[PDB]
Amino acid sequence: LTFESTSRFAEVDVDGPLKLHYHEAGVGNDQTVVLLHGGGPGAASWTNFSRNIAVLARHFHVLAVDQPGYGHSDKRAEHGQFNRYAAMALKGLFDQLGLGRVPLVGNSLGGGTAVRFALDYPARAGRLVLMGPGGLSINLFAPDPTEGVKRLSKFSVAPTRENLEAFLRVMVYDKNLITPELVDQRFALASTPESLTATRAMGKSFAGADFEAGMMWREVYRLRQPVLLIWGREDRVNPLDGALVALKTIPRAQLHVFGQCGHWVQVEKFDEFNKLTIEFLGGG
Amino acid sequence: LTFESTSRFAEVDVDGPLKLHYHEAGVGNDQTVVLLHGGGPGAASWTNFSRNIAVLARHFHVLAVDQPGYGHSDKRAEHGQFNRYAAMALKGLFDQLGLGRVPLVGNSLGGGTAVRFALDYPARAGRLVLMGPGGLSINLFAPDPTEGVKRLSKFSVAPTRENLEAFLRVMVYDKNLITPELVDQRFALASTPESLTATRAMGKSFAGADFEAGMMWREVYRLRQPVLLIWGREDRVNPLDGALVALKTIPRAQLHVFGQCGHWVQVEKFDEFNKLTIEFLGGG
């Protein structure tokens, strides 16, 4: 399984043509699962879920979708509230590929997208697995912006190698996972002019007049499916106090917290994460 | 596997002879695991872990120990702080059976016993699985006593069938698990004169001058092993806000919360509980 072997494109309509890049594996497995990556600079499906796709494709038909503005999907200079824009793109892909009701796995930004999708198109979303998710998290104790959000803003204003490294260090509990190669690789993807365009256009959409659609902690009492929340105890981006409203209000919620784990659960606890996701989604 | 086929006795020394009753299954399985039951009236190993022993004995050598004052273990009229008394009895059994370092699974009262044991005899305790545990729980938001503790006290003062039923109803989210047969069975065991003696002697030991040994939320930063905390979201005895100090201070802690689940996790989520315990303790 490689970037190239799994790479797929689709054209969907969201206020005009929109190119979506995704990865496909485990074709023929009975159960399809959609993976939605996190929102850090230079993030994309393949790099986000590298320690996971190969393992999950043993059990599931995996579609790992680059959200609009990331990886090889379109990087428009302007859009509405990001999670609803991303959910509309996903609905386009579901319709194009003929998907019915499919479970979603969403990390950070992609967890917000998974939830907005499950709220707006309730019959198309199955079980959700959400890792340090945006949108449905509200940090009842942590002052906003958090250390993780501040370092992301600083990179967006001064997109240097040093500021990217400072951002990546507050993603993980074990700062040795932040290797020169990782930094070099992510900096290379994050600093292209169209990636910077996509990241700037992000800032105006969470901060713009469309903000209420982002406040999904207000709405998740409506989710009817089982939802597994997964958190790193040491998450410095979306800290653990953000899980509480969703745990309380989602009728069939579950929460799993890993000690000695930051925001990148799927990396730092990759094995325990894969096993929890496989069991929760029904073993395939 | 039956009560009778699995039933075992040992005599250990704790301020004189003490008869311990336990159940044994999965003999010859490489990995021994000790189960410690909850503290409700008429509680014991076999009835507490009926939906679990058979499944766990497929993977582990299971010892399910009736704690002093419960089931067929000795029911003394007097003892010190209960968890240290129970941990001393367990240390006696470990020494008698030749056990080295063994993982412990503890529900409620038995979770407090497992923790006191792991603190006082650190080289004899392996991984801990703690379900709505006493001792290391401190309800930061819930006023004490909780609804569950109050109904237990009321039964202790007026040990009637009606007061036992009211206690058992706040153990579970789905009140239909509280069948006439369950009530009849538990009432029969709970209302014997020596069981009432054991339950009264309990009240004077958590409330007596030995109370600090009970406050194990103060001490669990010392645990060096992986610890899996398991909670019912709707636990009305030891509610979910009691998990927070242990989750924060145990270095290798994990927490799993089940929505639509009360204090009896091992009953209401028996399947998910068995699977989590099997994976966490290493699959056997």
Added chain:
Amino acid sequence: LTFESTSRFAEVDVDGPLKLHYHEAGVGNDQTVVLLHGGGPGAASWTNFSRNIAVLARHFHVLAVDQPGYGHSDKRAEHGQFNRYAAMALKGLFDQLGLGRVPLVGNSLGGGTAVRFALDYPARAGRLVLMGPGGLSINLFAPDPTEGVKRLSKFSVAPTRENLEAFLRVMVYDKNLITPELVDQRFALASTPESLTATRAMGKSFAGADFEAGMMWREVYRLRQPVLLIWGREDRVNPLDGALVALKTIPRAQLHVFGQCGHWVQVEKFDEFNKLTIEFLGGG
């Protein structure tokens, strides 16, 4: 100041004529404040604020309003979502009295009414003082219904003096505040056919298709005024964990918690409450 000297009536139109009883005091004083009582069986303005009205009336022009269904206000058998119903009546009274923008003080149910008024008529509500308020509270840890709400429901089904005394005793930390005289007086008002009609109507009102109107924790991020939340640490009706979403999301929030205090802050900590309220609303 007496019940009779302060008594006033007004008629307002809320899907038809609606009689409202209120108490007026400190007519000399420039700053008006509206007081909205808690919602237990037999509650009313004069008794709910008996330790507060005389002290506040030295500084403010006090309007203590019997909410629809309570005291000498009309007790219809049918109405929509209670807090919205009571807020519409209060708004009718504001228009009749020629009030513009006025601070509100609200205990429990009255706190819910105050918040619904401030959200629906934002230009008419000044500073809010809310004591153990319903509506904006969401108990992130406590299983619902709480011990307090269950006792209130038991009285609705079986309106006996014993069930009312049991409810009143979980209202307060110091159970000696629940004197035989208080129980006899509240029970005499609560047990009338008109009051019980009101009590049941209010119940039904909270679980319709307008349930969203009761979930005010979703909306208080829009409040622009200073808001003083006041809680008893030992509130067993609306416990302390219910304060967190409001404290986080109300921009100019403050929280005062009293140890050794239950749900009736204005009674149990009357002197500290009187002083917090006078200072917060500007000393008059």
Added chain:
Amino acid sequence: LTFESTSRFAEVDVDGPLKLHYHEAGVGNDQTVVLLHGGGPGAASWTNFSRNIAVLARHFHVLAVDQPGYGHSDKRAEHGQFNRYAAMALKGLFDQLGLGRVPLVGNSLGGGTAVRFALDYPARAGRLVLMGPGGLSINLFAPDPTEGVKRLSKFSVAPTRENLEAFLRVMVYDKNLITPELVDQRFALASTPESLTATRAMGKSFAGADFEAGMMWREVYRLRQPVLLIWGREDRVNPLDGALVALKTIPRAQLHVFGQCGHWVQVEKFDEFNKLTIEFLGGG
């Protein structure tokens, strides 16, 4: 009242002579109160309480004490656990001044010192007012070290004006309180070799084998006096989640939280803090 008019020295024995600087005001007033400042680089009594001393001195006999390592008190290179060291010095000063039982007001580090004094010399501490206190705080959700503590550590390693300004800016909600004059004054005191010697010594002092002395959240259940905890909702040094164990376990606790307020409550909310403190300590 001036720095010079109020200035006083005393010598006490704490493993050898120890010079203590303090400010004395309101000598007429019957009720003594001891003020203990926060612990940032260059902090001292006069500047830390500059918005409070004159107001409190109208009601109380004020003793504002420069803790060892700060202001004009001795700055040894070596000492044990800081709060215990500072508490021993204060106790030496109580004995020299002939004080019995006196209320203490403590910000941050000074809050930690106040609590250690009240635990080690229980008959000598009256009512406690603690603002964003160290020592009794345990951040149940925030990963440690917090943003605030990390900025303080960065200054210890690289004591520049830029690193001090960055630290001071995470101390407060309203960043305009961090004026060029304030930064220049604090930095001039913090950068002296004596102060930096103190700053580093204090660091080392917290991670010895006497670390348990710093974990005061384990011990404050033993405090018998009223304790007013005061917090900024936006404290990024000792965040709000650090209040919970103390509020739960101190029998006569109260908590006041201020929205739009960081770690320097006595500065950012000086008027509300002055009034809370005067009323709590009995008006003098």
